[PDB]
């Protein structure tokens, strides 16, 4: 999956943005947390599409956000 | 410490809010994690004041957030 350009993203509907961002976020999350990638991707997609798009272009910040999501999920079990 | 009312909180400066919310968050976090309470309270105080205030009146979600912060600190190792 080639990256989405900012021009493309603003030319898409809200639901098209979600599918394109979700697909590309899922692949990156799957490399870190393959089993929980669907749920963590769903958690990311609640953010504004500009913030979700930033994660695709900042691997350090994506990895931090995956850790944050796992910790939210771990705390939810308690 | 006595609790803050929402009317008081909205009438305080940002630094007045942080000190009032911090002192109260610290006491509650200290009962759960007395050693890491300064660090965890500092992590909490990066929230918006309305979000941090909601933790003071929701003990169950406060405990969840302490667990979350401990998890983040552990992953930082």
């Amino acid at each position: 999956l080639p990256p989405i350009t900012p021009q493309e993203l603003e030319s898409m509907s809200p639901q098209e943005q979600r599918a394109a961002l979700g697909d590309r976020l899922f692949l990156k999350v799957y490399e870190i947390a393959p089993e929980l990638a669907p749920k963590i991707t769903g958690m990311f997609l609640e953010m504004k599409p500009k913030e979700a798009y930033e994660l695709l272009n900042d691997q350090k910040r994506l990895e931090e956000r995956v850790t944050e999501a796992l910790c939210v999920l771990k705390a939810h079990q308690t | 410490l006595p609790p803050i009312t929402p009317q008081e909180l909205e009438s305080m400066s940002p630094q007045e809010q942080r000190a009032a919310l911090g002192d109260r968050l610290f006491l509650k976090v200290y009962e759960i994690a007395p050693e890491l309470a300064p660090k965890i309270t500092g992590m909490f105080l990066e929230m918006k004041p309305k979000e941090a205030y909601e933790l003071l009146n929701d003990q169950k979600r406060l405990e969840e957030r302490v667990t979350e912060a401990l998890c983040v600190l552990k992953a930082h190792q």
């Binding site: - | 500092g42 992590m43 912060a69």
Partner: peptide
Amino acid sequence: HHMNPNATEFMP
């Protein structure tokens, strides 16, 4: 969403 392990400690 904020849970920053580098945050400054709060001392009362």
